[PDB]
Design a protein around this motif. Structure first.
Motif, PDB file in Angstrom:
ATOM      1  N   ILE A 218       5.688  12.088   2.350  1.00 18.31           N
ATOM      2  CA  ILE A 218       4.861  12.021   1.155  1.00 18.31           C
ATOM      3  C   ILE A 218       4.347  13.404   0.789  1.00 18.31           C
ATOM      4  O   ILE A 218       4.396  13.768  -0.369  1.00 18.31           O
ATOM      5  CB  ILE A 218       3.749  10.992   1.341  1.00 18.31           C
TER       6      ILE A 218
ATOM      7  N   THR B 114       0.844  -1.185   0.000  1.00 16.38           N
ATOM      8  CA  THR B 114       0.000   0.000   0.000  1.00 16.38           C
ATOM      9  C   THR B 114       0.882   1.239   0.000  1.00 16.38           C
ATOM     10  O   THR B 114       0.539   2.245  -0.613  1.00 16.38           O
ATOM     11  CB  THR B 114      -1.005  -0.027   1.166  1.00 16.38           C
ATOM     12  N   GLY B 115       1.997   1.158   0.730  1.00 10.30           N
ATOM     13  CA  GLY B 115       2.955   2.249   0.825  1.00 10.30           C
ATOM     14  C   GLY B 115       3.661   2.485  -0.509  1.00 10.30           C
ATOM     15  O   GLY B 115       3.690   3.606  -1.010  1.00 10.30           O
TER      16      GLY B 115
ATOM     17  N   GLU C 219       2.877   1.567  -3.569  1.00  8.79           N
ATOM     18  CA  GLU C 219       1.980   1.944  -4.639  1.00  8.79           C
ATOM     19  C   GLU C 219       1.636   3.417  -4.505  1.00  8.79           C
ATOM     20  O   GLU C 219       1.633   4.149  -5.491  1.00  8.79           O
ATOM     21  CB  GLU C 219       0.725   1.067  -4.609  1.00  8.79           C
ATOM     22  N   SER C 220       1.280   3.821  -3.293  1.00 10.65           N
ATOM     23  CA  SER C 220       0.847   5.182  -3.060  1.00 10.65           C
ATOM     24  C   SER C 220       1.966   6.143  -3.407  1.00 10.65           C
ATOM     25  O   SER C 220       1.687   7.274  -3.790  1.00 10.65           O
ATOM     26  CB  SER C 220       0.372   5.376  -1.634  1.00 10.65           C
ATOM     27  N   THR C 221       3.217   5.711  -3.220  1.00 10.49           N
ATOM     28  CA  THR C 221       4.363   6.591  -3.393  1.00 10.49           C
ATOM     29  C   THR C 221       4.549   6.860  -4.877  1.00 10.49           C
ATOM     30  O   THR C 221       4.713   8.008  -5.293  1.00 10.49           O
ATOM     31  CB  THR C 221       5.639   6.007  -2.766  1.00 10.49           C
ATOM     32  N   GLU C 222       4.503   5.782  -5.663  1.00 12.53           N
ATOM     33  CA  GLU C 222       4.707   5.846  -7.097  1.00 12.53           C
ATOM     34  C   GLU C 222       3.669   6.768  -7.730  1.00 12.53           C
ATOM     35  O   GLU C 222       3.995   7.502  -8.659  1.00 12.53           O
ATOM     36  CB  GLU C 222       4.681   4.444  -7.702  1.00 12.53           C
ATOM     37  N   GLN C 223       2.424   6.697  -7.246  1.00 12.08           N
ATOM     38  CA  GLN C 223       1.306   7.494  -7.725  1.00 12.08           C
ATOM     39  C   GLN C 223       1.642   8.970  -7.622  1.00 12.08           C
ATOM     40  O   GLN C 223       1.543   9.673  -8.614  1.00 12.08           O
ATOM     41  CB  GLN C 223       0.031   7.139  -6.965  1.00 12.08           C
ATOM     42  N   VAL C 224       2.088   9.432  -6.459  1.00 14.39           N
ATOM     43  CA  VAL C 224       2.280  10.856  -6.247  1.00 14.39           C
ATOM     44  C   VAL C 224       3.462  11.325  -7.084  1.00 14.39           C
ATOM     45  O   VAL C 224       3.447  12.439  -7.611  1.00 14.39           O
ATOM     46  CB  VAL C 224       2.485  11.166  -4.752  1.00 14.39           C
TER      47      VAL C 224
END
Lengths: 54, 54
Positions: free
Chosen positions: B8, A38-39, A41-46
């Protein structure tokens, strides 16, 4: 003799405590993967995107 | 942990400030040409002409 039962119930007590421990070990495994993903994936998105030059 | 989010959101903050900077750099480019041309052209206009001798 009283000793006989004391032995037998100890056997049970150990076994139950084992089963109880198990569920926490198992659940910690399940959560590990879910958290880590979850961490990431969320990082790549931003972090990512495209820009129109002209 | 609180740290995770702090990281983030920093990533985002940087990126936004980049985009904001970009528009000024771009716009300064657009204006450069338009300004320079306007000056040159206007100068040539005033400076030039013909005269009837006879």
């Amino acid at each position: 003799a009283i000793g006989i039962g004391t032995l037998i119930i100890f056997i049970a007590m150990v076994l139950v405590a084992a089963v109880a421990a198990a569920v926490l070990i198992n659940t910690s495994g399940f959560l590990q993967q879910k958290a880590m993903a979850t961490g990431k994936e969320s990082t790549e998105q931003v972090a990512s995107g495209l820009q129109v030059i002209r």
